[PDB]
Design a protein around this ligand. Structure first.
Ligand SMILES: [Mg+2]
Ligand SMILES: [Zn+2]
Lengths: 251, 11, 153, 1336, 287
């Protein structure tokens, strides 16, 4: 692909074929001239070095390197280890409708309610705002609603207030220690730039209030909108599965 | 006990 | 392969040594296989001889002036107009090896950071249904004789 | 005293006598780089060793060579403050003179040939500023010094390899400074083995065969010749009495006539003396005793030369008989007492498969597939070639000091006797004599600075020219070749270019705090090349040895994965001439504590006895008590009065400059303060610069030498002050006759940092005041009158509040935001590039499509924002447009284009817009443009404002400087009389045509006419070249047309959720800003600013924090009475008592300063900067006591415990129990919220796997890791796990259906197949492994 | 060190006392990270081996399995029998010490209401239907796993198992890395599987390796228990009553003696000095 600087960049496979394709051509050119048999057997070495090098670089001997004096990424290292396609792009991934902040404590809440800041929650629900704009008809078209989202009419804060009521949200903290790694709250909107929690569930995460990064998630489908209510509301688990005494202990 | 093909050619 | 073609065009009747006349062949057979082969993009052999005519005298302009060289007197020395010197340097780069570690440690590679201006923005797929939806409406609001005509036009 | 000390004093509590002043805090950096470039005549340092070790170079044909003569560093072509702007490395050219001398093969010494000595440039070398930093590509960088293991030898013994027996394994290892290694290692079967560079193992005699020896010429060196004699009837022998020492009596061990030892009886000390008293030498022995022994030397027959038996074979009853039949009486054998001096090498001669010289030389060449020519030449290239091997005479020094040798100086080449000698000692420790060293003693570690290390690859630069000098010498023509043509000027700089910018050492310069820049030049790493690495590190390498004491601080280290590796050096440490570390000590002589100073090495500390710093010296007498708590040979104990030799210099020297500001460290645990000197390195300068109260005195010694404040080169009186520049007039005694005698100082205005913090200075002098030698002249970004000032003071309480201080969360008022004491500025950077594509050249103009009037409101004609507009995210800075390539579309718009007459555009918007959340003011622009392209409107207009900027300031240089030189025309005039009516009535120009006289007055005609032309010859070139480098274009990258780059400045206020910290490591998140009403307040009517959790005190063991808070209660406790007596405005002499009575308080203070010598207005200005409070100085271990804090607390009319009443703002009533409330110093960190909160609905994607990206700069989501996938299974949310694996991540035909169904009010699921998976499906199909899918 | 800290945090620390106390930090501070790294590798290696388990069927109906016993051997009461069997089910029809008084038709959930009926009697032995005897195809059944502790009832059919066990083993591992036999009180002496003989002194001699002590209350429950090896000497007897604050077992443990159940003369045969062994007589007494 052409790059942002106007140069190019290739993956490592697209020159290793240029080792195999070139050393293929040097063989078919050779056999119709019939060189003696100390040159011809040396040719069949390098294909077996090269059809190695398509399959694996760092296996059979000293690896085949590019200009950076570093080993070339083979086809085997596409599948091998934590760098491969398994643990970095197949099991865990990235996901959309996401965000993060510093965490802080607000004890004016109830148990199931958690904070959610304003100018985070404007991007985090942008498909919800467009649909409810086209349903009331205050927005004539989709592009007009994107034109009106910078106008910031007061009804936009009302339609967002309409849509965030009883729509649950997930709270996360990496790394997940056990089953209480993620819960589900109902949001309550404040005007700041930080996520507020309830103070009793800090011991469940083993998160202390000194600069973590807790992440949010928004369930899209109708079933998961029930599944937050049905399994992972903070009230529906006070029993930590390790041992049948409550994790909601005064800390 | 060598395996690198640089030495195998010059031998 | 150069050595084989050299022997059938060796000629003892000129009487000189073998090693001199042989040396011209495989050196020539080397340099075409550093030109079309061994490169990321197959660059024509006209451009490569200019590069060494540039890059030799660029070392000389560091020697001669004692300072770093300027493209104006380069084209004066290279006997070409200055747009061509401005045209020749735009090819001089290789790829920068997509799995390079642009991060400080082995955390990230450049292949996971390259953006794609190829597919779409997903709002625009919601545009192209709606503008299509309104056009079916106004075509229903058209007179029935004319309604077939712009449809296939 | 200095005048910066006079305008603010600092009461101290020092009791131990401060004896040696704090040294210049950048010694290991500045003294390093002076050794690289300054010309060293003989005892080579720096670049001089790189030349003579390579040059001269004989040609490979053996006819010609070439000689270095002298180098020369030209003047730097650029200056520093524009290299920040253009982004290029400032350097000098490296100019050398070299002489090409050719010998003719015809003549014996044919020097008559072409000698064309010329002066050829090769390479640029970046220089250092006067702070320590380099600039690389227009960025401040710093080289951190690397720790590695010393050259020489290294004895060790690993444990836990042969756990079948558990046998002790001794092994020795010799390591040179550059080249190939050498190792000696043992086995479970008692055999000495040799390994070269980790190959298959090799027995020890193989090198001894290769080193021109025989078995006769080896066995002399180790075994001794036990000589036996058959005297024609029976065998006899000789004996020293300590040779059958503790051995068995196989035979009747007797004398001539006194049988000493019976059968099977041991030989005690009695029978040893029995052989001493009579001195019986020739012991009669039976012939059976020679069995058990091995014959040492080859024995031939006199008639045929044939061996009866060979050397190193066990003799039997045939061979002993046959030597007596050929005729032999004297028999030389070996000495085998395997407890004391035993054979471990005699076992190895039989397992050695090679027998002679070349056969071993074959096998060692066989070790490192497929000659006599090669195998002899290779073994003289390993340990005998000066090219690929060097021992680097500091390596020679420990190599001789380890083996008890006699000389320092020597060679970098091994000697054949020396390899055998370490093999001798290694066998000696198998018996038990001697022992092996350790790794953690610093006598085998070394520091490695810039100038030593910068030469190292620069020698490898000359290797890159060494492979090319031979080529065009031997086969090229000889006389026409100028040597300028053949030395390649490119690669010699290219090797040293690979150092600065792609190492693990060339770090980013931390400019965000002045303390943070000074703890990042005194840091010593253990990473890099040739040292240790991150994962292969160990657990004995991270522990703190008691040789770290005084040389390497044990607290200042990060707590990440590099916890044991990064270490900093102590206060007074230096770098010795060899490279080892050193620390000062005071020498005790007969109890008297002297003023002499000694720097010790690493090794000599274990041989002496040193006392601690807390010994009570009895008034230039000695220690009071008999037992001084000392330390010796790595062990702490109690020793006598007379035996002690040395003493600690000050009590600071276990801590480095980071934590040695943290007051009352002596009452704290180690685990708390380790964050404490790390949580100060992340400070951001506030918009105010307010002094701290409780400090350690080093603020004056950390500010004036960290460079960030201006310093006075020559003391005197200041004539002029402006906010952009100050000048001084030097006193005439320091003035030279060659100068006019005024100095000019430029202050650095608003420029970018490298953590995006503000940098500006502020002049703290006024008009008309004296300045003494060396003082501070301008305040810094975190300075206040020459002291380190990082955070603010605030009044602090301690109680739980309504859960707002639940778990370590701290609380503010609005008063700390109204007085803006926690406000920072930031300066970000924005840029835009203009290119040419294959379709057409882009450009910048404000005529932009799809724009209304509001975004086009505040631009010029050229699409660049005016200098000083306000901005908001979503607007425009640069109006950039591109040639759109003509692509057709789906034909709905095509008839729609034909309905309203839609005009098409070849003008597609790709302009720069402001990133959102960012809102502030744009303060500076500048424009980069090529040379040859016509300079546009904003180019030449900003250049003409650039010209009259530069011209009228450099002309001001000759305005006042020549004004002193315009004054001496008058002095010459006065002699011969000053023409009083003919001097000032006419103007200055007619001062040549006055009344004149003879030769004294026409050499005046040569003096007036010369500096009218000499000083005209001075300034005119500096005008032109300054004009030249501006009116020229730019030498930029291929592909750019013009780049406009715009600095904008944003001011960030405190929000709920900026990180906060104290000064002991207690972190904090500001949870709520509060109106002033319901905060707690005292009985007098002031509120209290910060409330925090009081349950963090015992379970961090930070009783230092409570200890700090009481002093600040006293710190304003002196200050308020001063404010009580200044606005009420009593008197001068009332005040001068009250200050002197205040801070002359403690019983055993070291410092003594009396205000009786000050003038009156000085006291009136000493009252000035004490209104905010009185500072109190406390050293790291020479601290204060609770008796002494309670003294001055009584002076402040305040309760003695300092635990006062309160009232709540919400209840209005009395609290149940009083609260400790005082001043505390606090500060804020760089992890601000707008750096952190970052969210993403719909944006870009990847290229190869169609996933979203990661990063705030690329507007990317969050990672949903494999621990979270395991988390959802225990809940069992089936449907929720699907969207995180199909429709929020992958399916190109899936996820857009979500972006339609949500807008139409249907939250409907539909799954697909993830495009990660078919990549794996196309992956394994490419490996010839047919993976395919069945159907239902 | 022989001299640790003497003074305190309010009166100061000396320099060498401050320097040695750094080792208590930097040894421990580098250990937290390494342990964290190892443990996350361990948690990954626990979810892998147990991934298959879902509760497929309700009640497989297999037969008896493990009998449950307390862990309080060697010291005081540590884990009561009620608190392990809670949340499990009866492996069989189990009784009360009033004989033939069965409380269960072979399977009941043993929640705290029925732990009262266990607590008023003297039961210390109960058959528990473990997960080992469960024999359904590709999974485990609810009557073999019992009470889901996270909700508080029997687990519904389809909730995941192997992750919720591999999670709760993984989490606490962060803080993981950091003669003369006297009985406490009196009690009846009940020791079984024994082979003992009366001494020449008359008391109990341990001539079998399998014997170990058990301190029993007035009922039959165990309170204390200690292991006794071969060749040991007692002063008391079994099936009797002993006193409190009493060392009932006294022998030399440093020897492993070669004690004799047999009675008669001992002769010097089948061992010859100079042939089988040597004779190094006792230097002091001569014998
Ligand atoms: Mg936390
Ligand atoms: Zn079961």
């Amino acid at each position: 692909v052409p790059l942002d600087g106007g140069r190019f960049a290739t993956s490592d496979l697209n020159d290793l074929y240029r080792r195999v394709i070139n050393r293929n051509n040097r063989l078919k050119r050779l056999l119709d001239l019939a060189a003696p048999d100390i040159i011809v057997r040396n040719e069949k070495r390098m294909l077996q070095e090269a059809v190695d090098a398509l399959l694996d670089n760092g296996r059979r001997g000293r690896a085949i390197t590019g200009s950076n004096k570093r080993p070339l990424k083979s086809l085997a290292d596409m599948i091998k280890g934590k760098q491969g396609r398994f643990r970095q792009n197949l099991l865990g991934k990235r996901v959309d409708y996401s965000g993060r902040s510093v965490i802080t404590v607000g004890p004016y809440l109830r148990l199931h309610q958690c904070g959610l800041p304003k100018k985070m929650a404007l991007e985090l629900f942008k498909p919800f705002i467009y649909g409810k704009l086209e349903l009331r008809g205050l927005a004539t078209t989709i592009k007009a609603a994107k034109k009106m989202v910078e106008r910031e009419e007061a009804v936009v804060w009302d339609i967002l207030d309409e849509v965030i009521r009883e729509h649950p949200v997930l709270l996360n903290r990496a790394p997940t220690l056990h089953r209480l790694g993620i819960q589900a709250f109902e949001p309550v909107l404040i005007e700041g730039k930080a996520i507020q929690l309830h103070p009793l569930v800090c011991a469940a995460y083993n998160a202390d209030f000194d600069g973590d990064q807790m992440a949010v998630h928004v369930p899209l489908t109708l079933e998961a909108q029930l599944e937050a209510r049905a399994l992972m509301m903070s009230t529906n688990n006070i029993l930590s599965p390790a041992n049948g005494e409550p994790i909601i202990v005064p800390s | 006990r060598t395996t690198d093909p640089v030495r195998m050619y010059m031998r | 392969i150069g050595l084989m073609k050299a022997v059938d065009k060796f000629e003892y009747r000129r009487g000189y040594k073998f090693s001199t006349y042989a040396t011209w062949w495989i050196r020539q057979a080397i340099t075409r296989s550093i030109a079309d082969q061994a490169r990321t993009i197959r660059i024509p052999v006209h451009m490569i001889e200019t590069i060494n005519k540039l890059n030799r005298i660029s070392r000389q302009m560091l020697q001669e002036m004692g300072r770093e060289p300027t493209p104006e007197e380069l084209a004066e020395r290279m006997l070409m107009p200055e747009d061509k010197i401005r045209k020749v340097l735009k090819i001089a780069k290789e790829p920068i090896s997509m799995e390079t570690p642009i991060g400080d440690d082995e955390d990230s590679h450049l292949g996971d950071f390259i953006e794609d201006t190829t597919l779409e923005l997903p709002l625009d797929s919601a545009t192209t249904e709606s503008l299509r939806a309104a056009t079916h409406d106004v075509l229903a609001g058209l007179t029935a004789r004319e309604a077939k005509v712009l449809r296939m036009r | 005293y200095s005048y910066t000390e006079k305008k603010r004093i600092r009461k101290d509590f020092g009791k131990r006598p401060q004896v040696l002043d704090v040294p210049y805090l950048l010694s290991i950096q500045l003294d390093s780089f002076q050794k690289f470039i300054e010309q060293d005549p003989e005892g080579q340092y720096g670049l001089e060793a790189a030349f003579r070790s390579v040059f001269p170079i004989q040609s490979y044909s053996g006819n010609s060579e070439l000689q270095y003569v002298s180098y020369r560093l030209g003047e730097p072509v650029f200056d520093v403050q524009e290299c920040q702007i253009r982004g290029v490395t400032y350097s000098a050219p490296l100019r050398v003179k070299l002489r090409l001398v050719i010998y003719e093969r015809e003549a014996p010494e044919g020097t008559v040939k072409d000698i064309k000595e010329q002066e050829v440039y090769m390479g640029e070398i970046p220089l250092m500023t006067d702070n320590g930093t380099f600039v690389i590509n227009g960025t401040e960088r710093v080289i951190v010094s690397q720790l590695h293991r010393s050259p020489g030898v290294f004895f060790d013994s690993d444990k836990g390899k042969t756990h079948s027996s558990g046998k002790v394994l001794y092994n020795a290892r010799i390591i040179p400074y550059r080249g190939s290694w050498l190792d000696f290692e043992f086995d479970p079967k008692d055999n000495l083995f040799v390994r070269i560079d980790r190959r298959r193992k090799l027995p020890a005699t193989i090198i001894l065969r290769a080193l021109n020896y025989t078995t006769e010429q080896i066995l002399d060196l180790f075994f001794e010749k036990v000589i036996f004699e058959i005297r024609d009837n029976k065998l006899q022998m000789e004996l020293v009495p300590e040779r059958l020492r503790g051995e068995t009596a196989s035979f009747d061990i007797e004398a001539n006539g006194k049988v000493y030892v019976e059968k099977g009886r041991r030989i005690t000390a009695r029978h040893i003396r029995q052989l001493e008293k009579d001195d019986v030498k020739l012991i009669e022995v039976p012939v059976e005793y020679i069995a058990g022994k091995v014959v040492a030397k080859d024995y031939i027959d006199e008639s045929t030369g044939e061996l009866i038996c060979a050397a190193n074979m066990e003799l039997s009853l045939d061979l002993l008989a046959k030597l007596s039949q050929s005729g032999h009486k004297r028999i030389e054998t070996l000495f085998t007492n395997d407890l004391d001096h035993g054979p471990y090498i005699s076992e190895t001669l039989r397992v050695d498969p090679t027998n002679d010289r070349l056969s071993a030389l074959v096998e060692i060449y066989r070790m490192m597939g497929e000659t006599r020519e090669a195998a002899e030449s290779l073994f003289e290239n390993l340990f005998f070639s000066e090219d690929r091997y060097d021992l680097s005479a500091v390596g020679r020094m420990k190599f001789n000091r380890s083996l008890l040798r006699e000389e320092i100086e020597g060679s970098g080449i091994l000697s054949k006797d020396d390899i055998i000698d370490v093999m001798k000692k290694l066998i000696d420790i198998r018996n038990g004599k001697g022992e092996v060293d350790d790794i953690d003693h610093l006598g085998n570690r070394r520091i490695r600075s810039v100038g030593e290390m910068a030469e190292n690859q620069f020698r490898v630069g000359l290797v890159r020219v060494e492979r090319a000098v031979k080529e065009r010498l031997s086969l090229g023509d000889l006389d026409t070749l100028m040597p300028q043509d053949m030395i390649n000027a490119k690669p010699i700089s290219a090797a040293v270019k690979e150092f600065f910018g792609s190492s693990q050492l060339s770090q980013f310069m931390v400019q965000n705090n002045p303390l943070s820049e000074i703890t990042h030049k005194r840091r010593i790493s253990a990473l890099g090349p040739g040292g240790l690495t991150r994962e292969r590190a160990g657990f004995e390498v991270r522990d703190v040895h008691p040789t770290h004491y005084g040389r390497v601080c044990p607290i200042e280290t990060p707590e990440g994965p590099n916890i044991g590796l990064i270490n900093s050096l102590s206060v007074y440490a230096q770098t010795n001439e060899y490279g080892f570390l050193e620390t000062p000590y005071r020498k005790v002589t007969d109890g008297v504590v002297t003023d002499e100073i000694h720097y010790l090495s690493a090794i000599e500390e274990g041989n002496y006895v040193i006392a601690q710093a807390n010994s009570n010296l009895d008034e230039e007498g000695h220690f009071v008590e008999d037992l001084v708590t000392c330390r010796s040979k790595g062990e702490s104990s109690l020793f006598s009065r007379d035996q002690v030799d040395y003493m600690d210099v000050s009590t600071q020297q276990v801590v480095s400059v980071g934590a040695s500001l943290i007051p009352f460290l002596e009452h704290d645990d180690a685990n708390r303060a380790l964050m404490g000197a790390n949580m100060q390195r992340q400070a951001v300068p506030t918009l105010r610069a307010d002094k701290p109260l409780v400090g350690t005195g080093m603020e004056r010694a950390v500010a004036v030498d960290s460079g960030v404040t201006a310093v006075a080169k020559r003391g005197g009186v200041v004539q002029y002050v402006d906010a952009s520049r100050i000048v001084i007039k030097v006193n005439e005694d320091e003035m030279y006759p060659g100068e006019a005698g005024i100095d000019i100082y430029n202050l650095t205005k608003y420029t970018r940092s490298n953590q995006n913090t503000c940098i500006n200075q502020m002049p703290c002098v006024s008009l008309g005041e004296p300045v003494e030698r060396g003082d501070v002249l301008a305040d810094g970004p975190s300075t206040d009158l020459g002291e380190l000032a990082l955070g603010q003071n605030m009044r602090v309480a301690f109680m739980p509040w309504n859960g707002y201080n639940f778990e370590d969360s701290i609380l503010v008022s609005e008063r700390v935001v109204q007085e803006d004491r926690f406000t920072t500025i930031h300066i970000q950077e924005l840029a835009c590039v203009s290119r040419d594509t294959k379709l057409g050249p882009e450009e910048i103009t404000a005529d932009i499509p799809n724009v209304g009037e509001a975004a086009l409101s505040k631009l010029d004609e050229s699409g660049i924002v005016y200098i000083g507009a306000e901005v908001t995210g979503g607007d425009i800075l640069v109006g950039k447009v591109t040639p759109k390539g003509e692509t057709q579309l789906t034909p709905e718009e095509k008839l729609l284009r034909a309905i309203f007459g839609e005009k098409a555009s070849d003008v597609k918007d790709s302009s720069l817009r402001v990133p959102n959340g960012v809102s502030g003011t744009v303060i500076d622009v500048q424009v980069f443009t090529r040379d040859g392209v016509e300079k546009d409107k904003r180019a030449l207009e900003i250049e003409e404002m650039q010209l009259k900027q530069a011209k009228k300031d450099l002309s001001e240089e000759l305005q006042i400087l020549e004004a002193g030189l315009f004054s001496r025309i008058r002095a010459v005039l006065v002699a011969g009389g000053v023409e009083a009516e003919k001097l000032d009535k006419l103007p200055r120009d007619r001062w040549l045509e006055l009344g004149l006289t003879d030769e004294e007055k026409q050499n005046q005609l040569e003096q007036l006419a010369e500096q009218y032309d000499e000083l005209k010859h001075e300034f005119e070139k500096k005008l032109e070249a300054k004009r030249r480098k501006i009116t020229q274009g730019d030498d930029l990258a291929p592909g750019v047309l013009k780049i406009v780059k715009v600095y904008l400045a944003v001011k960030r206020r405190i929000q709920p959720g900026d990180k906060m910290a104290g000064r002991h490591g207690n972190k904090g998140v500001i949870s709520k800003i509060n109106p002033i009403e319901d905060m707690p307040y005292d009985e007098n009517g002031t509120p209290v600013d910060i409330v925090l959790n009081p349950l963090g005190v015992p379970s961090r063991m930070n009783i230092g924090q409570i200890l700090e808070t009481h002093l600040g209660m006293a710190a304003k406790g002196i200050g308020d009475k001063i404010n009580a007596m200044l606005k009420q405005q009593q008197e001068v002499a009332k005040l001068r008592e009250f200050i002197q009575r205040a801070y002359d308080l403690g019983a055993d203070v070291r410092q003594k300063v009396d205000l009786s010598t000050f003038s009156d207005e000085e006291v009136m200005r000493l009252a000035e900067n004490l209104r905010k409070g009185m500072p109190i100085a406390t050293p790291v271990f020479d601290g204060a006591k609770e008796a002494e804090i309670k003294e001055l607390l009584k002076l402040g009319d305040l309760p003695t415990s300092g635990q006062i009443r309160l009232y709540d703002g919400r209840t209005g009533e009395q609290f149940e129990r009083p609260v400790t409330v005082g001043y505390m110093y606090m500060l804020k960190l760089n992890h601000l919220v707008d750096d952190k909160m970052h969210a993403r609905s719909t944006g870009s994607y990847s290229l190869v796997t169609q996933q979203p990206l990661g990063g705030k700069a690329q507007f990317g989501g969050q990672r949903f890791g494999e621990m979270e996938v395991w988390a959802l299974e225990a809940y069992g949310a089936a449907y929720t796990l699907q969207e995180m694996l199909t429709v929020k991540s992958d399916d190109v035909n899936g996820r857009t259906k979500m972006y339609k169904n949500i807008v139409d009010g249907n939250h409907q699921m539909e799954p697909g197949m993830p495009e990660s998976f078919n990549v794996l499906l196309k992956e394994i199909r490419s490996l010839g492994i047919n993976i395919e899918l069945e159907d239902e | 060190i022989e001299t640790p800290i003497t003074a305190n945090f309010r009166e100061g620390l000396n320099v060498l006392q401050y320097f040695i106390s750094t080792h208590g930090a930097r040894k421990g501070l580098a250990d937290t990270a390494l342990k964290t790294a190892n443990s996350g590798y361990l948690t990954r290696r626990l979810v892998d081996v147990a991934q298959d388990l879902v509760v497929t069927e309700d009640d497989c109906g297999t037969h008896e399995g493990i009998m449950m016993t307390p862990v309080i051997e060697g010291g005081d009461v540590k884990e009561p029998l009620r608190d392990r069997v809670l949340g499990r089910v009866t492996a069989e029809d189990v009784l009360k010490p009033g004989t033939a008084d069965i409380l269960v038709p072979r399977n009941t959930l043993l929640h705290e209401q029925w732990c009262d009926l266990l607590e008023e009697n003297s039961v210390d032995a109960v058959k528990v239907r473990s997960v080992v005897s469960c024999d359904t195809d590709f999974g485990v059944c609810a009557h073999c796993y019992g009470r889901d502790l996270a909700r508080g009832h029997i687990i519904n059919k389809g909730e995941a198992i192997g992750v919720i066990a591999a999670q709760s083993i993984g989490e606490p591992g962060t803080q993981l890395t950091m003669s003369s036999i006297q009985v406490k009180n009196k009690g009846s002496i009940k020791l079984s599987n024994v082979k003992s003989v009366v001494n020449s002194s008359g008391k109990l001699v341990i001539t079998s390796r399998n014997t170990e002590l058990k301190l029993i209350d007035e009922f039959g429950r165990t309170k204390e228990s200690y292991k006794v090896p071969y060749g040991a000497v007692l002063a008391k007897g079994d099936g009797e009553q002993v006193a409190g604050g009493e060392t009932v077992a006294n022998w030399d443990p440093h020897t492993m003696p070669v004690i004799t159940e047999v009675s008669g003369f001992v002769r010097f045969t089948d061992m010859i000095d100079g042939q089988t062994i040597t004779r190094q007589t006792d230097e002091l007494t001569g014998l």
